[PDB]
Symmetry: C3
Subunit: 338 residues, 3 copies
């Protein structure tokens, strides 16, 4: 019945994004994606703490899907028989049936195919939602990602000017609730089901033990810093499926920010810190003006520095002393000073 | 001195709203409302937990009041002699005297009459605020509701087009702080005063034991789901007098959202999840496009599924396979699959 | 090389603000500021609790700096040899080098001079950020303030009309994490370093013990209430370097609010409660219409009343009975009443 060209997309692991056009002159297509659920123990912090994760495509976050307004998105969700739990998928971009959740519940050994029309532009969360208490559990165990629905003319500034990014990164932020023993040491388990009761008790107190980007403390620092160059316009998509965040690029700004994440609304300009509501994605464009290291954080700095929520950008280029300069390097305070 | 027609309004219990006009050609009136404080033990969760509530008109939230810009609102607040505490009322819609609180403190056995001019459009919180530590206590014990001040031309989209709702619902969200004994069981008391000291200790740690709509976990699910039909534009007013929330309609969107709640500002379009600042009301319009069950949550999913903060809509009509369809029902993963 | 006039600014302690022009016809200048770090034990609540604070210029918050777009800001940061820790400064208003942090690390007995160009309008946080876990620690120990970069034409309403304030106040909100002993009593220490380990444990649980304006519970109540007069337009700048807040003026509104704090964006009108993202400053203009006491709070009322986060305004002038009046004072409920 639906007679449109079909196009298979190969997803890539975050923070990278599969290839796509910004502006397009192609008409609507059926964009075909496959997500494979993987339950697995994963390392989440720099001390080697593990937890019983549940993922789309083996990553936290799940991969970013990119389509254009008016495309149809045909998703094959697979739940391998090595998994232990039922799973499903809810797209916040989609209309009806609990975002798809009511049409995608699959037991281990099953797959399902859902199609939804991309009628709403923006960045949106997708997440598992099997029912009842299993909804938060699967989400905070890692089963969430995002989808971006671009206007067919690409982004604009809400004032009639086109905006184009040179690079895009997807930062998925995950709140984790890892059980502790009586002495405060993190507990380990042999399966997600075994971890559940103790995890739920932590969840109920609404205070994460870890807040991480790309699935673990330090994931996007060091050798895995995000690259850019002076002069490049970078789109930073940020999602949080369960809990609020307040992104900030240390040493930079958000030139154009859609903190609620929806491209039918004009962006705000020149922000220091923006706000991702739990259960949403947002996006910020920034044109780098200075080389060096930038930290990208949630600006609850306890979370950023002590719970895992810091990424780095490494930006190549030439320093601009007009924007900032060290007029005098550290020196002893003058004895004359009063 | 004030020579305007008077109109008595009969309030109705949330989530329903008393009858009113959207657009009106009536001039300003003195709109007369009565609120009666009721202290009573109430059931707040599906396991039968009770707590010593304090209410306007016997409900959590208090009822939604609806007037138009330039009306005067004349409120008789009654504190029956069966109550134990003084009470008052602060309207965030009002100008002066701490929103009215400084003019409305009444002991049991007293009533007072306050008039305020509806100079500011939007949805607004009202709440009790007796003074000092009693302010948060009375609020988190249930003494909060909302008022909507409509423009006399009704709502608009901020771009010169009228917006009209077919139905309106008021969702009051309440954070509760129920004491526990040493084993974790919820404690019961014979009066609000007896509950206070233990409740304050819970409050101080800023983590609710329950987060509920319409006064209890499950209040708006099952037989009390909210009704709508495909094609109807529904206004969902959401308030939170003490603590942030992030509303989300699962399977839907916010077509037009005033998350800060004030109609002099253009709404945002096409949101997935919006944000109600503690101490405010906001509102979202959505036109239903698909039948079935929708969950309406705060998108901290722990709160939603595990602390009580889920409502349902039951929407009648015909399914639109163009927007969403199950292309292939759950099936065994092909043996060929790699 | 940079050949512009230089102008030394003398800072003043919050909540007051150093003298400045709104609109100016002066061209760009090098505006010279000095900040002196002071580590000291400070009283933070009305029961006399102390903690080992770290400050810019001896105050929490640090003082508000005011410049205009296109000015250069040349800051001498001094770390006296009586201090124990290294310190630095990150300006969210600045571009490059982690906001300046990477160019300003000074040991006790040193000073440094940083210049940054004020290319971005709005109110912005500045804070210490020495590296790693020391970043949140120094910030939540008090080392944060704000800077305002005004357009050279002053403020506007985003619709072509000038806005001018008669008074400005800077409210810095500080979340504090004071250790407790086994019985719940707050602990005291002889130095910041001695307090660190126990403080970090409190920080990790993300629940402040105190939330204060101007450095202590009650700082801006009583004799230190903020003054205004009926008819005056007051700008209230609010910052929070680490944690979200939801400001509300009890009995008033935000006539024009830049909750994200950046003057290139039109303000929202007529808000009840606004939202300061942790890691940002915002600002609200209000024209007082009624005399009397107003409370200014974060509208988590537990925080406001029980953790310290209430300020007062005392407003002189004549009461307007048209906006609000007590129609009937408290009286016994009529025996006839049903
Ligand atoms: O012996 C515990 C010690 O080993 C580490 C090694 O990296 O991790 C082990 O214990 C953690 C806490 O139970 C588990 O999360 C992990 O699976 C296990 O390898 C340290 O993190 C830990 O302190
Ligand atoms: O807004 C994008 C997309 O939403 C649809 C519904 O699929 O329309 C919604 O939003 C419209 C514009 O705000 C409303 O007029 C409409 O009533 C509502 O359903 C599409 O028609 C539109 O392209
Ligand atoms: O945090 C409580 C208490 O637990 C200990 C181990 O007994 O450390 C645990 O907690 C730390 C904070 O989350 C982690 O860094 C560590 O991996 C974990 O074992 C104590 O060191 C701490 O005091
Ligand atoms: O890219 C930052 C990197 O560049 C170096 C020179 O190789 O210094 C530049 O950047 C500094 C600011 O971080 C400037 O103060 C300096 O003048 C400029 O040359 C490195 O020192 C720095 O790590
Ligand atoms: O015996 C306690 C058991 O009874 C229930 C019955 O619905 O509730 C009682 O105890 C609760 C916890 O103290 C009270 O809140 C309630 O008032 C009382 O009826 C169960 O909830 C509870 O576990
Ligand atoms: O804005 C609605 C209503 O507010 C009043 C005061 O009661 O005006 C306020 O807002 C105006 C428009 O933003 C400001 O110009 C004015 O100074 C401020 O008091 C009413 O006059 C107005 O209708
Ligand atoms: O939550 C702590 C601990 O308390 C127990 C009773 O000892 O359950 C209480 O807490 C649950 C979570 O809030 C409630 O569902 C229940 O109504 C309440 O009695 C334990 O079951 C729980 O482990
Ligand atoms: O209204 C939802 C309700 O309708 C039924 C048919 O009575 O199925 C419709 O809705 C489904 C999506 O929830 C579609 O997949 C189906 O094709 C459509 O007929 C019920 O199954 C469903 O509960
Ligand atoms: O004896 C403790 C008692 O004295 C007070 C006096 O104002 O404060 C002392 O103890 C506090 C808690 O340790 C310290 O913060 C403070 O430095 C010290 O003067 C009371 O606050 C306290 O309960
Ligand atoms: O926006 C104020 C200020 O920012 C600068 C960079 O220092 O420009 C940024 O914002 C512009 C307008 O949004 C973008 O066009 C530009 O690419 C971005 O760097 C200044 O040029 C501008 O005055
Ligand atoms: O809050 C726990 C418990 O501690 C005590 C002292 O044992 O009080 C402390 O905590 C109060 C709440 O923060 C403070 O008002 C007080 O300054 C502090 O000593 C008990 O009174 C309280 O029950
Ligand atoms: O400024 C408030 C202050 O003024 C007094 C008179 O001196 O009363 C005025 O304000 C009241 C509202 O707070 C009005 O109800 C009253 O009619 C008006 O005169 C004081 O009572 C009040 O503290
Ligand atoms: O180690 N994780 O269960
Ligand atoms: O059923 N989900 O675990
Ligand atoms: O400026 N960043 O913490
Ligand atoms: O049972 N409530 O006190
Ligand atoms: O005085 N109020 O409980
Ligand atoms: O999509 N709702 O959790
Ligand atoms: O008393 N402060 O450490
Ligand atoms: O190094 N800062 O404490
Ligand atoms: O209206 N203030 O709590
Ligand atoms: Cu799942
Ligand atoms: Cu969701
Ligand atoms: Cu009350
Ligand atoms: Cu209030
Ligand atoms: Cu410092
Ligand atoms: Cu910062």
């Amino acid at each position: 019945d639906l007679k449109l060209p079909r196009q298979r997309v190969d997803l890539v692991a975050p923070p990278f994004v599969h290839v796509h056009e910004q502006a397009t002159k192609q008409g609507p297509k059926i964009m075909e994606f496959k997500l494979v659920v993987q339950e697995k123990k994963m390392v989440i912090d720099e001390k080697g703490t593990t937890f019983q994760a549940m993922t789309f495509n083996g990553s936290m976050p799940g991969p970013l899907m990119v389509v254009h307004e008016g495309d149809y998105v045909e998703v094959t969700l697979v739940n391998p028989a090595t998994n232990t739990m039922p799973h499903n998928i809810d797209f916040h971009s989609a209309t009806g049936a609990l975002g798809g959740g009511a049409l995608t519940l699959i037991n281990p050994g099953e797959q399902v195919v859902l199609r939804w029309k991309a009628t709403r532009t923006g960045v949106f969360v997708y997440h598992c939602a099997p029912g009842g208490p299993m909804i938060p559990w699967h989400v905070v165990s890692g089963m969430n990602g995002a989808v971006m629905v671009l206007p067919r003319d690409g982004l604009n500034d809400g004032h009639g000017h086109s905006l184009r990014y040179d690079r895009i990164y997807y930062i998925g932020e995950q709140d984790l609730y890892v059980p502790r023993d009586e002495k405060g040491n993190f507990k380990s388990y042999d399966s997600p089901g075994e971890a559940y009761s103790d995890t739920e008790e932590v969840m109920r107190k609404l205070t994460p033990t870890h807040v991480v980007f790309n699935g673990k403390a330090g994931a996007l620092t060091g050798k895995n810093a995000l690259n850019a160059n002076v002069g490049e316009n970078v789109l930073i998509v940020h999602s949080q499926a369960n809990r609020d965040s307040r992104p900030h690029l240390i040493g930079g700004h958000g030139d154009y920010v859609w903190e609620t994440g929806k491209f039918s609304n004009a962006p705000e300009t020149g922000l220091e810190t923006w706000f991702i509501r739990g259960g949403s994605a947002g996006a910020a464009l920034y044109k780098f003006l200075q080389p060096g290291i930038y930290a990208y954080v949630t600006h609850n700095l306890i979370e950023a520095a002590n719970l895992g929520a810091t990424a780095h950008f490494k930006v190549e280029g030439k320093w601009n002393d007009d924007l900032m300069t060290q007029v005098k390097a550290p020196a002893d305070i003058p004895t004359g000073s009063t």
